[PDB]
């Protein structure tokens, strides 16, 4: 998850 | 009938009709719609992506708009979908139609105004403790408590606080968007990696102590995921400082009782996004006074007044609307 | 010691109160002291701090107590705090221009056409340093003219009227004589 | 007082925003006020142009709107403005983010439902006094129409006729573009002269029989000006067939008597568009039926009832807007 | 000649009345019968037509001129020339669907990578075509139903209740012939 | 004028 990075 | 407590159990699209004949505006709801849907319609225009897709989205967005009990959850929520689609689309804005990269003016306003280059300070030494102290709240706290905040605050929080958390989250963010596209500038490990010298869009980012990270833990779970972002010159305001403030504030205005945790909290994460070179303290000034002002406006509005006899919401038996003219202590001459 | 004129708004901006413009004055201060509080982080850190940066972050510590106090009382008003919120707030804000002449002269005596426009002219970061700057600034004199304004028509009312260790007969002798400072400029 | 006949004559905005405190909405005007001011800001923030002089503009188009008097005219004349702003921004759209050029739909459509080409039928046989018969309607009176209409629709027609021929006009103009983005097709002139073949947005247009009227009174005015044009495929809906058609609906609904006239006046428009091999005849359908759809809704809504006993607009001394339930000939059985 | 159950809306797409229906189906129609008007110009200007597009041209006038008188008595109804106007349409469907299919088989019978893309597939085209003449079909089937049913409940009323050289008998013969058969149809 | 062309 690419907003504000975590896993995808 | 608890009708305060319970959410909204019909399903037919034509009690939201009649109420949208109902219901009445002022300028403050003209300015508010007019500007959400056009930025709506603007990343419906924008955005490539097939069209098939994006009019499927948006029927299916329509009609989870229109259908009372989701209606009320996605409706409220709209701010945030603004703020998510908006932030996708300018990742897909044309490469020279955004302003040039500000690489000086960050460092400048932070050494004037708050002495030293506060990263730098608190970078200055490192250690693997430390590495994972500041990795908690940036890669999992941060992501973890938007949702957490909505459920503690619909449990525990009145009724109705929910949909200002979602307005105030959203407008926070939005403005954040604007402001990170209007005024573009080099997050702190540009200075020290490559130093003073002019940028452009045309170079990776760097992950800055999360590669340390992916050292430790064995993947490669940041580097990449950030050499190749498109908000590298994204780092003003804040928004990691002004979720917190805001996420902070909002635990402070319906719990009032252990305060002291979120301040810490607050301050947790700001000592972990200038450790990981990430952010200059302006940054997160700029953030958290943003994220200060849209709170004070949403709590003097919208927000209604915390009890503090009452456990959960659903012990909740009545919606009270803060009233700036009666509680001023320059009163009327009340006594 | 005597009275002067010293025209004050009776608004931030035009579009609210005074007290809620209080506590968001109060509210943006400390903030900005949480930076001296990270200062004293640089004790530990190893990054070799100088005498004036040490004199700054303590004084930002100093005043965020203080302001902290007065962030405490917004509601129910208490005009030996705000007396010595408002004159330790204009001290506080001499010393603010004080310092950032001081550090602003510290930074500038330390300091293929595609990619040349993506780039900000030299000219174009001096003007966002210098309207950034100032921006702080006259929100800073707005903040301060705000306190001000409050404390007197506190002043002007009924109620909020002003009538163990060293610590605290020093503490409060100096909201009493910080109070008579404020009565004889604003009064 | 003649409060009906007179114009606006106040200066302040706070009368402007106090009428937008008073003013209730439905639906028809939020989706209205929604959809219109989504295209004024997306094309503030597409349109290419120095970001001072967008600001410049649409800060004097904001203090236009607002003061009372220029308030009225250029509120109402608010679609027309959406129309020209977002014709000129999609002349600086991308070229390879719209749809495929169709040469082969219009033909299609014609020769099925209408018979044989009649732009050829029509463009057969060719002489200098036909050459200038098409001249006129398509070059001149096109463009010096719109105003003579709002003219004499404001001096001789009711008072408010022109709000809703504004309202009437900048619709009609704003689907037509949008249709044209949508669907775009090659002319007449491009079977005439390539044939059947696939097109490109790489072509430059051609001008037709104002070739021949270049040739004529030798200037170069046209040629030039047609072939670096960005509507090139923009044939369909006709947009001269739509515009003479709402003028002339509107001359027969203000002035029911001379009728025959603007009637003869379409015709003659119709002749010189597929003359000069500029659409064909299912262009000018499409065009045709959209305005008069457009002006149907408008006439029974919006516009008043005018009369007939009455000279000019400054002897109205009323204003009656049409009602559909009463009037139908289908009653309630009223006898 | 007797009874039929013949289904028919009282609206178009729900939210409108029939009259207002009828004044929009009979503007639509009159303006593509505007094209005959062109045809009989094709006579003048040199392209040779053939028979059949001299039929479906004269025929779109005959029509033309009805349809005008339909035009004109909307606020009015006359039962005669409603009647006369609904078969005639009836009439007028029969002959468009048969024309339709005569010219789409008088066509068919008679016919880097950016630039690639710029440019419709064959696939499109022929969509586009079948659809664009199919929503013809459709709309002009669904007019003669409003037509039909403007007729029907023009008849079952009070008022609206229908009771010089070989012109005029022609013509108001046709027309009490034609009331009949429509009633009969509807009635 | 280019729109809907008439001078410039």
Same mark, same amino acid.
């Given at each position: 998850?690419?907003?504000?990075?975590?896993?995808? | 009938? =608890?009708?305060?407590?319970?959410?909204?159990?019909?399903?037919?699209?034509?009690?939201?009709?009649?109420?949208?004949?109902?219901?009445?505006?002022?300028?403050?709801?003209?300015?508010?719609?007019? *500007? +959400?849907? /056009?930025?709506?319609? *603007?990343?419906?225009?924008?955005?490539?992506?097939?069209?098939?897709? !994006? @009019?499927?989205?948006?029927?299916?967005?329509?009609?989870?708009?229109?259908?009372?009990?989701?209606?009320? *959850?996605?409706?409220?929520?709209?701010?945030?979908?603004?703020?998510?689609?908006?932030?996708?689309?300018?990742?897909?804005?044309?490469?020279?139609?955004?302003?040039?990269?500000?690489?000086?003016?960050?460092?400048?306003?932070?050494?004037?105004?708050?002495?030293?280059?506060? /990263?730098?300070?608190?970078?200055? /030494?490192?250690?693997?403790?430390?590495? @994972?102290?500041?990795?908690?709240?940036?890669?999992?706290?941060?992501?973890?408590?938007?949702?957490?905040?909505?459920?503690?605050? *619909?449990?525990?929080?009145?009724?109705?606080?929910?949909?200002?958390?979602?307005?105030?989250?959203?407008?926070?963010?939005?403005?954040?968007?604007?402001?990170?596209?209007?005024?573009?500038?080099?997050?702190?490990?540009?200075?020290?990696?490559?130093?003073?010298?002019?940028?452009?869009?045309?170079?990776?980012?760097?992950?800055?102590?999360?590669?340390?990270?992916?050292?430790?833990?064995?993947?490669?779970?940041?580097?990449?995921?950030?050499?190749?972002?498109?908000?590298?010159?994204?780092?003003?305001?804040?928004?990691?400082?002004? =979720?917190?403030?805001?996420?902070? +504030?909002?635990?402070?205005? =319906?719990?009032?009782?252990? !305060?002291?945790?979120?301040?810490?909290?607050? =301050?947790?994460?700001?000592?972990?996004?200038?450790?990981?070179?990430?952010?200059?303290?302006?940054?997160?000034?700029?953030?958290?006074?943003?994220?200060?002002?849209?709170?004070?406006?949403?709590?003097?509005?919208?927000?209604?007044?915390?009890?503090?006899?009452?456990?959960?919401?659903?012990?909740?038996?009545?919606?009270? !609307?803060?009233?700036?003219?009666?509680?001023?202590?320059?009163?009327?001459?009340?006594? | 010691?005597?009275?002067?004129?010293?025209?004050?708004?009776?608004?931030?901006?035009?579009?609210?109160?005074?007290?809620?413009?209080?506590?968001?004055?109060?509210?943006?201060?400390?903030? $900005?002291?949480?930076?001296?509080?990270?200062?004293?982080?640089?004790?530990?850190?190893?990054?070799?701090?100088?005498?004036?940066?040490?004199?700054?972050?303590?004084?930002?510590?100093?005043?965020?107590?203080?302001?902290?106090?007065?962030?405490?009382?917004?509601?129910?008003? $208490?005009?030996?705090?705000?007396?010595?919120?408002?004159?330790?707030?204009?001290?506080?804000?001499?010393?603010?221009?004080?310092?950032?002449?001081?550090?602003?002269?510290?930074?500038?005596?330390?300091?293929?056409?595609?990619?040349?426009?993506?780039?900000?002219?030299?000219?174009?970061?001096?003007?966002?340093?210098?309207?950034?700057?100032?921006?702080?600034?006259?929100?800073?004199?707005?903040? $301060?003219?705000?306190?001000?304004?409050?404390?007197?028509?506190?002043?002007?009312?009924?109620?909020?009227?002003?009538?163990?260790?060293?610590?605290?007969?020093?503490?409060?002798?100096?909201?009493?004589?910080?109070?008579?400072?404020?009565? $004889?400029?604003?009064?």
């Amino acid at each position: 998850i690419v907003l504000x990075v975590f896993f995808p | 009938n =608890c009708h305060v407590a319970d959410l909204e159990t019909s399903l037919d699209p034509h009690q939201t009709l009649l109420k949208v004949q109902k219901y009445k505006p002022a300028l403050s709801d003209w300015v508010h719609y007019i *500007f +959400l849907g /056009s930025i709506m319609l *603007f990343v419906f225009i924008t955005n490539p992506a097939p069209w098939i897709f !994006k @009019i499927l989205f948006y029927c299916f967005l329509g009609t989870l708009f229109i259908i009372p009990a989701t209606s009320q *959850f996605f409706f409220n929520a709209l701010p945030i979908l603004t703020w998510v689609a908006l932030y996708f689309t300018s990742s897909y804005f044309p490469d020279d139609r955004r302003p040039p990269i500000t690489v000086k003016v960050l460092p400048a306003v932070e050494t004037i105004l708050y002495g030293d280059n506060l /990263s730098d300070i608190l970078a200055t /030494s490192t250690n693997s403790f430390l590495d @994972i102290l500041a990795w908690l709240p940036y890669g999992l706290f941060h992501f973890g408590a938007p949702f957490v905040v909505a459920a503690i605050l *619909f449990v525990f929080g009145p009724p109705t606080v929910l949909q200002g958390y979602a307005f105030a989250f959203g407008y926070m963010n939005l403005f954040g968007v604007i402001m990170q596209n209007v005024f573009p500038a080099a997050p702190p490990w540009y200075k020290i990696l490559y130093g003073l010298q002019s940028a452009n869009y045309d170079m990776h980012g760097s992950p800055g102590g999360l590669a340390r990270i992916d050292k430790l833990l064995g993947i490669n779970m940041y580097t990449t995921a950030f050499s190749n972002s498109s908000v590298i010159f994204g780092a003003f305001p804040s928004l990691h400082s002004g =979720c917190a403030t805001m996420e902070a +504030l909002f635990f402070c205005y =319906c719990f009032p009782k252990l !305060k002291p945790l979120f301040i810490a909290y607050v =301050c947790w994460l700001w000592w972990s996004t200038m450790y990981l070179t990430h952010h200059y303290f302006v940054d997160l000034m700029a953030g958290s006074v943003l994220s200060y002002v849209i709170f004070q406006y949403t709590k003097y509005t919208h927000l209604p007044i915390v009890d503090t006899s009452l456990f959960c919401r659903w012990s909740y038996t009545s919606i009270e !609307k803060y009233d700036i003219s009666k509680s001023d202590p320059l009163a009327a001459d009340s006594n | 010691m005597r009275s002067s004129l010293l025209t004050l708004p009776k608004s931030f901006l035009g579009f609210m109160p005074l007290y809620l413009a209080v506590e968001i004055v109060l509210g943006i201060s400390i903030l $900005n002291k949480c930076s001296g509080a990270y200062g004293i982080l640089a004790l530990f850190t190893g990054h070799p701090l100088d005498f004036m940066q040490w004199i700054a972050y303590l004084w930002s510590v100093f005043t965020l107590i203080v302001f902290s106090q007065g962030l405490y009382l917004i509601h129910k008003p $208490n005009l030996l705090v705000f007396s010595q919120i408002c004159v330790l707030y204009t001290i506080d804000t001499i010393s603010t221009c004080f310092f950032t002449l001081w550090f602003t002269t510290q930074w500038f005596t330390l300091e293929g056409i595609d990619i040349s426009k993506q780039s900000a002219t030299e000219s174009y970061e001096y003007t966002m340093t210098i309207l950034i700057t100032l921006v702080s600034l006259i929100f800073r004199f707005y903040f $301060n003219f705000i306190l001000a304004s409050f404390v007197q028509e506190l002043l002007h009312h009924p109620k909020y009227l002003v009538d163990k260790p060293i610590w605290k007969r020093l503490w409060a002798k100096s909201q009493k004589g910080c109070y008579k400072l404020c009565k $004889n400029l604003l009064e």
